[PDB]
Amino acid sequence: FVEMVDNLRGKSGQGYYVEMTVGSPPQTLNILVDTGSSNFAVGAAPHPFLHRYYQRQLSSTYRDLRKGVYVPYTQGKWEGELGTDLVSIPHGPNVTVRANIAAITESDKFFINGSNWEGILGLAYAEIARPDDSLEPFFDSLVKQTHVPNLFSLQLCGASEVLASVGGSMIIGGIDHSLYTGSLWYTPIRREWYYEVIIVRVEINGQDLKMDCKEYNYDKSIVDSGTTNLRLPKKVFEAAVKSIKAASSTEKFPDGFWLGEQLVCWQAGTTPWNIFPVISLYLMGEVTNQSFRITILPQQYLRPVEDVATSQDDCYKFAISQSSTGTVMGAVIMEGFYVVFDRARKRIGFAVSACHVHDEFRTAAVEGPFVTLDMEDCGYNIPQTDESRSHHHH
Ligand SMILES: N#CC1(OC(=O)[C@H]2C[C@]3(CN2)C(=O)Nc2ccccc23)CCCCC1
Ligand SMILES: [Zn+2]
């Protein structure tokens, strides 16, 4: 898997992407790696934020499926035309697949200026593909058409006129032992739609937030590489920010800082990391009544941004924010860890990443087991709409 190491790039806060080729002859494009969605979709018409885009008509192996697709996210949306073509990952497995591709013809608040990606690779399950679960996701096609094992793993590595470059690895088809240290701990995938997990306890510097554990998973908790922040349900966000504010209270920051909308700075090299607390999320274990914890540092949840004006200073953005759509374990969380998406065994593994940023006193940690007795159920059941109910599934 050495040829897949360091195959991801991007700008801090703007997504990690992998190079792919679509079509014959191959058109090269940079594709956002997104475990929070299930479509393969590529810019296919001019846009102010795209250098280049997919030209269906220049590919001898394109086949039009004569069907449109509309995809709205909580933030951002796009539409396009469905088809299939030949697809490869140059710094990936040595194979070519015929996959579904959505050629994006219109978009809004989707493409990111300066990000250097032109599409998205949705690595989650068919159940949330658009327009429905009969549009086979890319990874499913890869596994079906080739020998590739039904697993992939992600190592996202954290960081004056441009945002910092970042690197990572997407290991397709297995696990590379150079990318982590210590033990790999797995949490069950609750349901194969998103990569949904269950958080059973949250601590901030060793202190339990003491919420009903359903609040942590209201309305779901998911691992999404394409979400940049750690995003927490309103109630949890507010408890968490109250505790982090308390720990850091020698420093009085503006409200904008805690809303993720304003940088705070210190003289080069003098950041008082030790006044910010560690956050531990306890995830359900493979064994009943077991859990293990993943522990992240302020070096993960404070994102570095070099200020054009005060470039003499180390400045940071707060990269935890409020959610109304569940807990999202985004790139902030993932930057601590080597994360194994073990679709074959319906589980997600975490180990301490060999590239996580830390300091001389504290480290991002993956530890267990921890045991409850009569561990209550922490999962939420989403209200079922008539629209959703009426769908058939043949
Ligand atoms: N909506 C949603 C969620 O994420 C997604 O659907 C994908 C697409 C994403 C980031 N991950 C998004 O949302 N906007 C956006 C914009 C550009 C690139 C990637 C994305 C996040 C909330 C919980 C459900 C899943
Ligand atoms: Zn029917």
Swiss-Prot record:
It is a single-pass type I membrane protein. Monomer. Interacts with RTN1; RTN2; RTN3 and RTN4; the interaction leads to inhibition of amyloid precursor protein processing. Interacts with SNX6. Interacts with PCSK9. Interacts with NAT8 and NAT8B. Interacts with BIN1. Interacts (via extracellular domain) with ADAM10 (via extracellular domain). Interacts with SORL1; this interaction may affect binding with APP and hence reduce APP cleavage. Interacts with NRDC AND NRG1. It comes from Homo sapiens. It comes from the Eukaryota. The chain holds residues 60 to 453 of 501 of the full protein. N-Glycosylated. Addition of a bisecting N-acetylglucosamine by MGAT3 blocks lysosomal targeting, further degradation and is required for maintaining stability under stress conditions. One of its GO terms (cellular component) is Golgi apparatus. This is Beta-secretase 1. The gene is BACE1. It is found in: Cell membrane; Golgi apparatus, trans-Golgi network; Endoplasmic reticulum; Endosome. Its main location: membrane. The keyword Transmembrane applies. GO terms for molecular function: amyloid-beta binding; aspartic-type endopeptidase activity; beta-aspartyl-peptidase activity; endopeptidase activity; enzyme binding; peptidase activity; protein serine/threonine kinase binding.
